C-alpha cells in the first residue's frame with residue numbers, strides 16, 4: 439500500500455528484518471493478479 | 487530419449503505436482519479434480535490459486 443512506486447530502470451528496494459512476516463495477508467488476499475515462488479511452496483512461507 | 491521423445495514435445499507424459507496429503511506406499515491416484523491451495527473453495531474447472 440505504497441502510494442507511488444519506482445521505475446524499473448531504478449527499481450526501489452526496502453529491506454525487511456527483525457520482524458514477523460504474515461504471508462496470509464499476501465497469499466489469501468485475492469486483490470493481486472499473480473504470485474509465484476521459485477525455491478519454496480507458497481503455503482510453506484509461514485513455516486520458514 | 488530416442489524411443490518416445492518428439493521435437494515439439496511428447497506431451498502424453500504427465501506427472502502430479504499437487505496432492506492433499508502424501509500417498510501411502512504403492513498407492514495409485516488417477517484423480518483429475520482441481521486442487522485448492524488457498525483458503526478459498528474452488529468448485530469449477532479453474533480459479534484463483
Ligand SMILES: *[C@@H]1O[C@H](CO)[C@@H](O)[C@H](O)[C@H]1NC(C)=O
Pocket residue numbers: 439463467
Ligand atoms: C491496503 O489498504 C486497505 C485499506 O486500509 C486494506 O483493506 C488492504 O488490506 C491493504 N492491503 C493489504 C495488502 O493489506
